[PDB]
Amino acid sequence: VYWDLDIQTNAVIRERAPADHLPPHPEIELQRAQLTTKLRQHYHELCSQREGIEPPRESFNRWLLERKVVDKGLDPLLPSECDPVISPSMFREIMNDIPIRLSRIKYKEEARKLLFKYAEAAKKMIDSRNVTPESRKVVKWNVEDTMNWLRRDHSASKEDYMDRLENLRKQCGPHVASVAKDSVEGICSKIYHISAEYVRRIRQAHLTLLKECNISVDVQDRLVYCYPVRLSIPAPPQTRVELHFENDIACLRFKGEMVKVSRGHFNKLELLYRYSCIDDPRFEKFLSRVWCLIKRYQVMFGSGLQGSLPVPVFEALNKQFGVTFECFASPLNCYFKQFCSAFPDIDGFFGSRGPFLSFSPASGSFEANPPFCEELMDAMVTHFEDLLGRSSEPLSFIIFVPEWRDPPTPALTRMEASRFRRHQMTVPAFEHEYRHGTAVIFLQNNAGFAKWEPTTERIQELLAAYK
Ligand SMILES: C[n+]1cn([C@@H]2O[C@H](COP(=O)(O)OP(=O)(O)O)[C@@H](O)[C@H]2O)c2nc(N)[nH]c(=O)c21
Ligand SMILES: Nc1ncnc2c1ncn2[C@@H]1O[C@H](CSCC[C@H](N)C(=O)O)[C@@H](O)[C@H]1O
């Protein structure tokens, strides 16, 4: 019991026309996977060649999320038409690992080595690259001073080695960043432009496949309860996908390419499909779409960027606050059968109402636990407040985000200043679920505060769901 797919939605939206996404097909999903692998390899080579570092961990996945906040292009996963070209997310993260990535340390001798590795790398940067005479002398001085200190006979403690490195980095940081800035911007641009070329190839291959199937590629303000995203383009025929089970693992094979998912999740996807898909009454296309679904989420992750809430917390949210809907989810991790997700082209067959920024409820009770992408969280807040002020009908959002204070993130700062905030608290931090600290913000309008008020009792039952 990791989900409850019997709960009915209370989200109300304007009736919307079916979406224009090209319907998914394993041939196209496999090509997207192969090209995304190549794109990750291009990113690895650029970081190595231009800055002598590994790609910052999780930065490519966070780049996919930031780019989709502004992407206007045609791929459901890779970006291709973004303003601005340079991602502030990828830029931030690469710069933080220049001239080296600071790693975790346990031992006095590991802190000593890291302080030395940093000083050596900063020197090599100054010796080999274009730098102003002002920046050159500041770095060179700090580096020689650190080497003179390490040259002393009597040794210091682990915390002194760590403090020394912190201070050296505060001093050299700005100078090192000015030396690498144009180079790092060039990595951000180049990987964006390679992505755009891959998107164009995938798009042409997908259009050709529909033409081969003789499939052609070319509404009210009435309120309705929400429903899954529908595609206007007819889906292509099922392809041959084979299924067998192996120690409670579902194994789906398309043309020699295997994907795996647990039996429990497979059975859940079968139920979501029954509740959500309207074009496949004999399940002819079901295994083709499950194969696409698993492959797409494997490609997205590349096999630390998001948390999940315990089941009893979702139970409390539904019982105490009438929550029926997840603003950020996937068919694999959702608790409810209605949710928003990143990939409407494939997730709609399993209950997705599409990406959250494109979803406009006039009323309902919602939970939101976004991935750890600062730009997405900030757009999420802008969207919240736009919806809360466009509707007088009961509307509530209970939001879970990490308590980032050093520095604060704009989303959390803006939510705390919101005229819609009814309550805020701190709950246990996100832990790994088997299926810092967490800020919980209640944003409601007048009618939402009236219907689902955060009273003392209801707050206690929610807190009890962790205990
Ligand atoms: C700990 N932390 C993580 N982020 C975001 O997450 C990215 C990676 O942050 P990190 O500290 O390099 O990695 P970790 O969170 O996996 O330990 C940053 O570039 C920010 O976008 C953070 N963003 C802000 N504003 N404040 C924080 O304290 C903070
Ligand atoms: N634009 C978008 N709209 C909705 N969900 C998105 C999204 N971009 C990414 N996501 C999804 O947001 C989820 C965050 S993890 C949240 C897990 C669980 N549903 C919970 O609410 O606790 C991930 O599944 C991620 O893929």
Curated annotation (Swiss-Prot):
Substrate binds at residues 62, 92, 374, 404-408. One of its GO terms (biological process) is methylation. One of its GO terms (molecular function) is S-adenosyl-L-methionine binding. Changing residue 374 to A: Strongly reduced methyltransferase activity. Changing residue 430 to A: Reduced methyltransferase activity. It catalyses: a 5'-end (N(7)-methyl 5'-triphosphoguanosine)-(2'-O-methyladenosine) in mRNA + S-adenosyl-L-methionine = a 5'-end (N(7)-methyl 5'-triphosphoguanosine)-(N(6),2'-O-dimethyladenosine) in mRNA + S-adenosyl-L-homocysteine + H(+). Coiled coil: none annotated. Its main location: nucleus. The keyword Nucleus applies. Its EC number is 2.1.1.62. S-adenosyl-L-methionine binds at residues 369-372, 430-432. Cap-specific adenosine methyltransferase activity is inhibited by zinc. It is an enzyme of class 2 (transferase). One of its GO terms (cellular component) is nucleus. Keywords: Methyltransferase, Nucleus, Transferase. It comes from the Eukaryota. The keyword Methyltransferase applies. It is found in: Nucleus. Belongs to the CAPAM family. Cap-specific adenosine methyltransferase that catalyzes formation of N(6),2'-O-dimethyladenosine cap (m6A(m)) by methylating the adenosine at the second transcribed position of capped mRNAs. This is mRNA (2'-O-methyladenosine-N(6)-)-methyltransferase. It comes from Danio rerio. The gene is pcif1. The chain holds residues 178 to 673 of 721 of the full protein.
